[PDB]
Amino acid sequence: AGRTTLQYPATQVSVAKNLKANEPVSFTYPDTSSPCVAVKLGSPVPGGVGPNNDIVAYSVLCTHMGFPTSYDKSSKTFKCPGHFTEFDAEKAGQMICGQATENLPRVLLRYDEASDALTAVGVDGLIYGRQANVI
Amino acid sequence: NDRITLPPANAQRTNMTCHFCIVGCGYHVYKWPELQEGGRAPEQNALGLDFRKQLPPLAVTLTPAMTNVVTEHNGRRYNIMVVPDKACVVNSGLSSTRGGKMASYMYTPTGDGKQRLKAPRLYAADQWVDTTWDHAMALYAGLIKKTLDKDGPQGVFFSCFDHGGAGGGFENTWGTGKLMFSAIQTPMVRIHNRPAYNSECHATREMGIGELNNAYEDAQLADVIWSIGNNPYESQTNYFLNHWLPNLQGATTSKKKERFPNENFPQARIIFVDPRETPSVAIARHVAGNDRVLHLAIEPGTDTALFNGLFTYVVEQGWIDKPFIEAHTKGFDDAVKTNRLSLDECSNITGVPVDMLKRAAEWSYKPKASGQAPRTMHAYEKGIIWGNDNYVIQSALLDLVIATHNVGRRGTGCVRMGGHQEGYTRPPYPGDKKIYIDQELIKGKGRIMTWWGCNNFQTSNNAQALREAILQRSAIVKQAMQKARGATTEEMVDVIYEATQNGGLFVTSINLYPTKLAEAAHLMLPAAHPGEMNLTSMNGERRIRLSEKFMDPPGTAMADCLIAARIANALRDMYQKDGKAEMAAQFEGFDWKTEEDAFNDGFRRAGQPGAPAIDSQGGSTGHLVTYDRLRKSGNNGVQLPVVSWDESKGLVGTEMLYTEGKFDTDDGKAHFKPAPWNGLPATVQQQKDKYRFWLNNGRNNEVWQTAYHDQYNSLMQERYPMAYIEMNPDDCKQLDVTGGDIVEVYNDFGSTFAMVYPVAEIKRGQTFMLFGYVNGIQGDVTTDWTDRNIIPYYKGTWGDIRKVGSMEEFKRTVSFKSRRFA
Amino acid sequence: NDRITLPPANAQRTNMTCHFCIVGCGYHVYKWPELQEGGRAPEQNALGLDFRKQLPPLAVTLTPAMTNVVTEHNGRRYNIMVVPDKACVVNSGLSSTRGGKMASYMYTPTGDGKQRLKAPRLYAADQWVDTTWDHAMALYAGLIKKTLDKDGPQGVFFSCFDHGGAGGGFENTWGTGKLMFSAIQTPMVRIHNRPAYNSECHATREMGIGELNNAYEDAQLADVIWSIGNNPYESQTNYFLNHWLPNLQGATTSKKKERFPNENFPQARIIFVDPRETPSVAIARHVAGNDRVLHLAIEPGTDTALFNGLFTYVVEQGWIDKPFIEAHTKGFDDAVKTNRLSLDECSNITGVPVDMLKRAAEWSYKPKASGQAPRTMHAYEKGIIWGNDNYVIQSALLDLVIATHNVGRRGTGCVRMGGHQEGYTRPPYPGDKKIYIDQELIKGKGRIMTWWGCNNFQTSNNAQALREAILQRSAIVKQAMQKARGATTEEMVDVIYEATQNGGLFVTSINLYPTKLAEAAHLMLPAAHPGEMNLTSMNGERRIRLSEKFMDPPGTAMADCLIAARIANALRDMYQKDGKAEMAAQFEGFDWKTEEDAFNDGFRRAGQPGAPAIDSQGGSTGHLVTYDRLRKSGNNGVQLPVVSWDESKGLVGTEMLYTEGKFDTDDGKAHFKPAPWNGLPATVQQQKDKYRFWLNNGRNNEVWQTAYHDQYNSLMQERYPMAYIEMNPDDCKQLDVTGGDIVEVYNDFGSTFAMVYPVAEIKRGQTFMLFGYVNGIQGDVTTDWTDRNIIPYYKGTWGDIRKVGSMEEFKRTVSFKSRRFA
C-alpha cells in the first residue's frame, strides 16, 4: 500500500447558510450505515466551521454500546437511551457523564467560502461497531 | 484515531475481574504478537463479531481505550484487548467507564502507566534516587528491627489496604496481615479508608447479620429496593445497570412469578435516602417514572431519626413479621421502647413530609394483597457508613429490617453495596484496644510509618492536620540524613532512628506510583496489579474469581504479598545473624515464590487442623478453592462459602445467607439494638454553627478513587482538571461564581480548593465536592470526629466558600452541563 | 513501530533552528492535517525523496522520533515532521541525536511532553493545585511590590537564563532583562549556569577578543585545531562532523589552496587538552590516524601551566609574529617575564612529556615551509571555563594566541565552542558589585526567588548546600500559609511576606515542567518553547536565525518575554492603583502582544537615537534585521553584525572578527595579561588531600542538560536510568564494583549517587560523572570555590566512593560497553 490513512469519501452535507441555529441536520458519513448530525450552535466554539465558526458535526452512535443518541436542543448535548451517557456538542463530544471511554466522534467538515459548501471529509475518533471508520 | 487491530482467531484469552469497584465485572484479556491481527470476518477474529459491516447496538463494547501494546521483560511487544465477558452473570457484557479503561491503565513504557514505580526509590536526604531492593530491605528491615529491639512493636506503624481487587485480594491481605500481625506483631495499624483497625459494620455483625448476605439475583426478585447513602449508578454501575434496572423495567416479573406462583408482584419501586438528588435518582425516574421513585431527601446526618420513625410506624401498623420476631430474634420489645419516634417528630428532624414517610412504609412493609410482605432489599453505602454515628445508624436500620423479615427471604437483604471488591484473609488483630492512628502520628508517636496501597494524604479524615504533621516529621529525618557522608546502611539506620527520637518519622510507601506521598516519603517500593500477577477476590455477592496473570510487571515491581515475604525474610535473616532465634522464628512462614503460595498459606488454611487463628471471608471451606478450580469456573466463579466440590460438579456455593433464620450470634437469633437520636456530633455542629455550607462529598462516575491512574489520562484531565464542587445556582450568584471559577473551601479544620460546578439539583446551603482527588483535596475540611469504633463522619462537615477567580481555560475546555440525565 | 506517515507535497513548511546546542543546526518543520499523507513518489511528498524503493545512505534523516501528532487549541490534529535542512550551511542536513528528538519533545497530550506545565500551579500550604493567571500575578506581583516598597529591589532575587535557543533568545533575554533591570531594578540576579551576574569570558573580552570571533568555515581552513576543555563530538556534534572532520579528511584542502595560492597546506591535525580520553579523542584518531592527533592528557587544573610553557617556548624559538605584536598588541614583554615557564617545569606540573609539548608547538606555531605561520584555530569550552581559575587560564591561552597571530586570520580564532545558542539583548546590570547569589540565599537573604528557565537544584555548584537551604526556607513559607483560612490574595501576600522576615523564601519557577524545583516552589508558571512561539538566536559563528511558530503552546503556556510583560503590567497596574505614578512609570514599555514586539523593542533598538543603554549581540545594526528579512534568509540567516541590507541583496553580515587588527579595547590593540601559576585553590586542594578520586563531570552525547525532556523519554531512561560515573576498571576491582552497581560519591561538600560505568580509558584515581541529572545530581560534591569574577571551578573537586550494591535491573537493561569508538 504505503498508506497509513483511511480513504475517507468527500460528501456534501449542505451549504452553511441553510442551517438554522440549534436545528440539527441528519446525514450519513462515511457510508449509509453511519448516522451523523451537523448543527449550527449559534455561538463560536473551538473548531467550529462556517461564517460564525459555530457549525459542528458528529457520529450519533453512542461510543459505549452503539445506540443512536438523540440531539437535545435545550442542552446542546447528545443523550444515549442505553446507559444514559451524555456528550457535549459544544466541547467536541466530551462525555458529561456516562459509561463510554471515548468522546463522541467528530465529523470533520471543510467549509468553502466561495460556494458556502460544507463537505464531510473525515472523522476524528472511532465510530461505534467498526474496526475502522471506513469499511 | 480511527481504527483498531482485531485479536486473531487463535489469540490467547485469559480471565480478568475488573480492577476497581465491588461489582467485580468479568472481562477477557486477549493477548497476541504486535505484528499479527484478526480478520474482519467473524470466524477470523477472537471476538467472533462481523466487522465487514456496521455492528448493531449492544453487539460489543470496544474502543481504543480498551486496547494497548505491552513490552514484556523479553523486549517483545504484544497487542492486548481488555473487554467485558458477555456470558459473565455479574455484568452480562457491560463495562463501566472505569473498567473500560483497564487496557489503557496496564503498564507500558509510553502510555498512561509510564510513571509506574519500576524499582526502589530513596530520598537520600535532598534528592530522589533509585536504590537496590537489598539496600531498601536493609534500611527498612534495619529500622523495623531497631524499633522492635528498643521500642517494641508499638513503634512500627502501618496504614494498609484491607480490601479486594487491585491492590488487595486474598493473597495480598494474608501476606500483609501475616507480616504486620503474626511476625512484627504491631497493633499500630490502620486501614486504607478508616483510621483504626475496625469494621464498617460492627453493629450489623454484632446483631448477627454480615453485610454481604444476598445475591445480585435478589435485586432482580425484589418488590422494592432501598438505596441508603448510596449513588449506585455512579458507584456500583453494572449492579445497578444489569440487575436493578431490569427489575424496574419489568424484565424480571415473570421470574418472580415462576418462583412464587401465589404471590402478587407489583411493578417494582425504588427508594433513595440521600440528602442529595444524584444521577442515580434522576436515572431511576427516567426508567421507572416519577411515581415509582421516592427520593427521601433527608437533612444531613438524620438517618437514625428516619429509621426510628419508620420502625415505630411499621410496629404501630402491625406491618411486621411477628412469627419471625418470636422464633428468630431477641430484644424487639426493648427496641420498640428505646427507638420510639412519631412520624411528626421524624418529619421535623429529617425534613421529610409525613406523607412521604408513610408512602415509603406502604410501598415497603404493608402486606401485598396476596398476604405476603413486600420483598424489600435494603442496600446501603458510605452516606451512612461515613454518616452521623455509623454504629447507631446500622442499629436503627437493622431493627427495621429484622422486624420486617427483610433478611433471608429471596428478593431481600440488608446489604452493603460495597466499595472495592473484597478479599480478606488475615490473622486476628494483635491488640485489645482501638487506636486512632492518625492522632497518634500527629502527636509524634511511631518511628516508622508504611502507607501500603493507600494514600491518606488524599483520603484521611482531617487530612490537612495529617499532611502538616507528616511533612514536618519527614523533614526532620531528611535534615538528619543529610549530615551523613559515606555511612553504611547500619550507620544510616542509627542516624534515622536518632532523628525519630527528636520528632522525626521514617515514611515508606508501597505503591504503583509515587503519588502525593512522595512529598514526604523516604522510601518507595514498586508493586504489581492484577494481570501482572494472579489475584483472587470476591464481589458484593461474595462471588470469588481468579484474575489471571498475562504480562510482566514494570521493572522489578512485585506482588504485595511477595513484598511482605521479602520484608519478613530480611527481618528473619537479621535476627538469625544477631543470634536471636526466638525473634527469627516469628518471621518464619514466608517461603513464597509466587502469589499462589500466599493463597495456599492463608485462604486455603483457614479453619484447617493445626492452623493458627485465621479470619477469612472464604470460611473454613476455603481449602476447596484452588486456582485451577477457579480457572474452570470462569468469570462466574462461585459464591462463598463453598458448600461442596467434586470433579463432575465444580465448586458449589451459597446464594443467600440466613434463609433458615440462623444468625451469627451466640444463640442463633438476630439481635435488635437501641438507636438513640442525639443530633449531630458537637464537633460537627460547631462547624455548622460557624459556617454556611454543608460540604457533602463522594464519588464521580468517571473518576476512580485518588485518580492514581486517571491523573495520567489526557481525557480524564481535560474533563476534570480540578476537583469540582456542585453548588446551587442561587448560591453561585450570591458568590458571583459560575462554572470554571475556582473557590477556596474552608473551616476550622482546613482550607482546600475546587472548581465551581453549578448544579440546579443542589439545595441552597448544600454542596458536593469530589473526594480524594489529585488537585483540590476534599478531606482537608473533614473533622476529626469518629463514632465509638473510630469510624469518621466523613459526610459531616460544614465550611465557607470564597471566590479565587475565573479559570478561563476551564471555561474553554470543561463541560459544566448537567450530569443528571433527563 | 514499522512505518511513517509522509508529508504531502503541499504540506506547510516552516524553518526551525535546533532547540538545543550552540551549533544551531537548521531544520524544517512539516505540518499537515492528521488524515492526509504524502505519496511514495518523490514529487508526491514534501521531502522530494523516492520511497518506492530503498533509499541510499545519507539520503535522509527520518525516524519515528522525528514525527508526532499535535492537538491544537482548536481541537484539530496535525502530523508534524521535524527534519534537518540539507541546504543549511551549518549542518548540511546533519541532525544530532538531541535535535533529532525535537518532534517527540514537542507538546502533545499523550507523548513525551504530556507533563508540560499548562496553567499556573500553586502550592497552597500543603498541596499542589491549579490557580488562575490573575491570582498568580496578584500573589507574585503583590510580593514583588511589597518587597520593593519595604526592602527595595535588593529583596527580589532571580536566577535566569541569559542564553539563546529554546528557553532563551533575543526576545526572551530582552523581556527578562528589561523586567529585572529596567523595571524592578534588582541587582540580586544570577545566570542559569553561574552564581553571579558575570561573563565566562572576562579575560579574553578585556584583552580585546570577544569569544565568538570566527566562522565555522574557519574550522575548514585551519592547519591545526586545538580543542581545549572540550568534548566536541558529544557537545558540539555537527560543528565537529560537518566542519572539523572534512578538514581532517582532506576534503577542504583544495579550498585552502584556492584562497592561498602560495601557502603549503599539510594534512590537518588536531590537539586535545583534556585530562580525560573522550569519545572525541577516539573518533579523531579513527578519522585522522594516531599520528595526526595529540591528546595532551594534562593533570586536572594545569591548563595555565600548559599555556605558559607553550608561550615561553614559542617566544624562545621565535615562532611568533613580531610585526603583528609590534603593530597591534600591548604588554607582550611583560607577559614574557610574568609567564616564563621552562618545558621541564611545564612537564612536571602538567604530566605531559617534553616531547609532546614540543610537538604541539611544532605542529601549531613553527612556520611552514612556504613562510607562513600555521592557521591554528584554538577552540575552548567548559574544561577551562569551569577550570582552575577561569580568568587566569584565558589570560595564559590568549597570550599564546595573540603572540602567534591566531586571531583575525582565516583558519584561526581563539573561540568558545559554546553551550546553548546565544541570543543576548539586555539593559546594563544595575549594580556595581558581583554578588554570589547562592551564598546570599543560603545566608537567609531575599524575600522572593524566581528560577526562570533554569534549575539550580540540579546545576548549582555546591548544589547540596543550595537545596538544603532552599527547601528549609520554602518550608517556613508553607508552614505560614497553612494557618490561613479564607484569606484574600492581599492578606496572603502579607502572611508570606511575614514568613520571609522569619527566614522564609517564596519560590517561583517559570518553566516547561515541574522539575525537582517543585519540591520547593510555591508557584510555577507555564512557558512556551520555539515552534510554540517565534524565536531568534545565533550560533557559535554569530549566525542569527528565526525559528517560526507552527503550533499552539499547551494550555495557557506563554513566551517568556510575554510572561515578563504580564508581570510588568501587573506591577504597573498595582502602582497606578496605589497612586504612585513614578513607580508605575518604571513598569512602562511592556505593551507587547507578540514575541516580535520584544524583538522590535530590544534587539532592533540597540544603539538607535532615543534608545536607552542596550547591550546586544546584534550591535547597533540590529535594526536592519526583521522577522520577514530572516524568513527570506532561510536557515542560513546572517552572521552578525549585519553590515548592509537592501531588497535586492538581503542581509549582508560579518564572517570573521579582527581581520584588520583592530581589537575591542581603548587603543584598538590586543592586550597581553600576566598568568600566574598558583596550583589548585586551597578549597579544592583540601578535598584532593582528604579524598581519593578526581570527580570530573560534564556531558553525555545523548542526554541534554538537566534531562527535562529526556526524563520522560522511555528510550533515554532505559539507556541512562541513573547518572553514571566512568571508573577505571582496576579501581572498580579494588572497590568490588562493576557495570550497573550503585555507588555513593561524597566529600565535605555533599553526598550523591551514581551507577558504575567501567571505562578502560579512565585513569586510576580519576572518574567522570554525568552532570545535571534527574537521578543522582553530580553538583552536590562540587565546592563553593570561584575565581575573582565568581566563576566556579565545577571541574575541580575530589571525593571518595562507597559501594551501595548491585542494581540487577541496570545489569539486565543498560549497556556498559565502550562509548569510545574504535
Ligand SMILES: Nc1nc2c(c(=O)[nH]1)N[C@H]1C(S)=C(S)[C@@H](COP(=O)(O)OP(=O)(O)OC[C@H]3O[C@@H](n4cnc5c(=O)[nH]c(N)nc54)[C@H](O)[C@@H]3O)O[C@H]1N2
Ligand atoms: N472525605 C472523604 N474521604 C474519604 C471517603 C469519602 O467518602 N469522603 N471515602 C473513604 C473511602 S470509602 C475509601 S475506599 C478511601 C480510599 O483511600 P485510599 O485507600 O488512600 O485511596 P485509593 O485511591 O483507593 O488508594 C490506592 C493507592 O494504592 C495504589 N495501588 C493501586 N494498586 C496497587 C497495588 O496492587 N499495590 C499497591 N501496593 N498499591 C496499589 C494507588 O496507586 C493508590 O495510591 O478514601 C476514604 N476517604
Ligand SMILES: Nc1nc2c(c(=O)[nH]1)N[C@H]1C(S)=C(S)[C@@H](COP(=O)(O)OP(=O)(O)OC[C@H]3O[C@@H](n4cnc5c(=O)[nH]c(N)nc54)[C@H](O)[C@@H]3O)O[C@H]1N2
Ligand atoms: N465511580 C466510582 N465508583 C466507585 C468509587 C470511585 O472512586 N468512583 N469508589 C468505590 C468505593 S471504595 C466506595 S466506598 C463506593 C462508595 O459509593 P457510595 O457510598 O455509593 O458513594 P459516595 O459518593 O461516597 O456517597 C453516597 C451518597 O451519600 C450521600 N450522603 C451524604 N451524607 C449523607 C448522610 O448523612 N446520609 C445519607 N443517607 N446519605 C448521605 C451523598 O449525597 C452521596 O450521593 O464507591 C465505589 N465505586
Ligand SMILES: Nc1nc2c(c(=O)[nH]1)N[C@H]1C(S)=C(S)[C@@H](COP(=O)(O)OP(=O)(O)OC[C@H]3O[C@@H](n4cnc5c(=O)[nH]c(N)nc54)[C@H](O)[C@@H]3O)O[C@H]1N2
Ligand atoms: N557540576 C557541574 N555543574 C554544572 C556544569 C558542569 O559542567 N558541572 N555546567 C553548567 C552549565 S555549562 C550550564 S549551561 C548549567 C545548566 O543549568 P540550568 O540552566 O539549571 O539547566 P538547563 O537544563 O539548561 O535548564 C533549563 C531549564 O529550563 C526549562 N526550560 C526549557 N525550555 C524553556 C523555555 O522556553 N522557557 C522556560 N521558562 N523554561 C524552559 C527546562 O525544563 C529546565 O528546567 O549547569 C551548570 N552546572
Ligand SMILES: Nc1nc2c(c(=O)[nH]1)N[C@H]1C(S)=C(S)[C@@H](COP(=O)(O)OP(=O)(O)OC[C@H]3O[C@@H](n4cnc5c(=O)[nH]c(N)nc54)[C@H](O)[C@@H]3O)O[C@H]1N2
Ligand atoms: N550532548 C550534549 N551536548 C551539550 C550539552 C548537553 O547537556 N548535552 N550542553 C551544552 C552546554 S550548555 C555546554 S556549556 C557545552 C559543554 O561542552 P564541553 O565543555 O565540551 O563539555 P563538558 O563535558 O562539560 O567538558 C569538556 C571536557 O572538559 C574536561 N576537563 C575537566 N577538567 C578539566 C580541566 O581541568 N582542564 C581541561 N583542559 N579540561 C578539563 C572534561 O574531561 C571534558 O571532556 O555542551 C553543550 N552541548
Ligand code: F3S
Ligand atoms: S467494570 Fe469495573 S468499576 Fe465496577 S461497574 Fe464493573 S466492576
Ligand code: F3S
Ligand atoms: S541538531 Fe541540535 S543538539 Fe547541536 S549538533 Fe545540531 S544544534
Ligand code: FES
Ligand atoms: S449504549 Fe450508550 S450509554 Fe451504553
Ligand SMILES: [Mo+4]
Ligand atoms: Mo471505599
Ligand SMILES: [Mo+4]
Ligand atoms: Mo552551558
Ligand code: NA
Ligand atoms: Na489545605
Ligand code: NA
Ligand atoms: Na546530596
Ligand SMILES: [O]
Ligand atoms: O471502602
